[PDB]
Amino acid sequence: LRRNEQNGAAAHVIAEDVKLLQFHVATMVDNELPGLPRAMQKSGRPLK
């Protein structure tokens, strides 16, 4: 995200990039969000 702002990337790219950052931040706090994908550990086992 920092490079995109530094390089003045497309607004939609940042908007999509921000969405992924929001997912991981929310996912780390809680991996059982309502009606949202479960972030596995690359093996089908949901992260705690």
Partner 1 sequence: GYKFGVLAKIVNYMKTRHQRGDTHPLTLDEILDETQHLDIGLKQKQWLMTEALVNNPKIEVIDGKYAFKPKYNVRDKKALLRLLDQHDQRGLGGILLEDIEEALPNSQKAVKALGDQILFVNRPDKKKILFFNDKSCQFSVDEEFQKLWRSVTVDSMDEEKIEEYLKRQGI
Partner 2 sequence: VPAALKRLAKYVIRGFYGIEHALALDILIRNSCVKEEDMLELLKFDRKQLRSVLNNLKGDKFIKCRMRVETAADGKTTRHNYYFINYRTLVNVVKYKLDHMRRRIETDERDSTNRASFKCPVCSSTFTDLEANQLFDPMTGTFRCTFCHTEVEEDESAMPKKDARTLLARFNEQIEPIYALLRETED
Partner 3 sequence: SGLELYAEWKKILLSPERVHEIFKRISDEECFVLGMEPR
Contacts with partner 2 by CB under 8 A lie at 10-12
Q: Tell which phi-psi region holds residue 15, choosing left (phi > 0), alpha (psi between -120 and 50) or beta.
A: alpha
**Binding flag, residue 5, partner 1 (CB under 8 A):** yes
For residue 43, the minimal CB distance to partner 1 (Å) is 36
For residue 11, the minimal CB distance to partner 2 (Å) is 6
Counting beta carbons within 10 angstroms of the beta carbon of residue 15, is it exposed (0 to 12), middle (13 to 18) or buried (19 or more)?
A: exposed
Nearer to partner 1, 9 or 36 (CB): 9
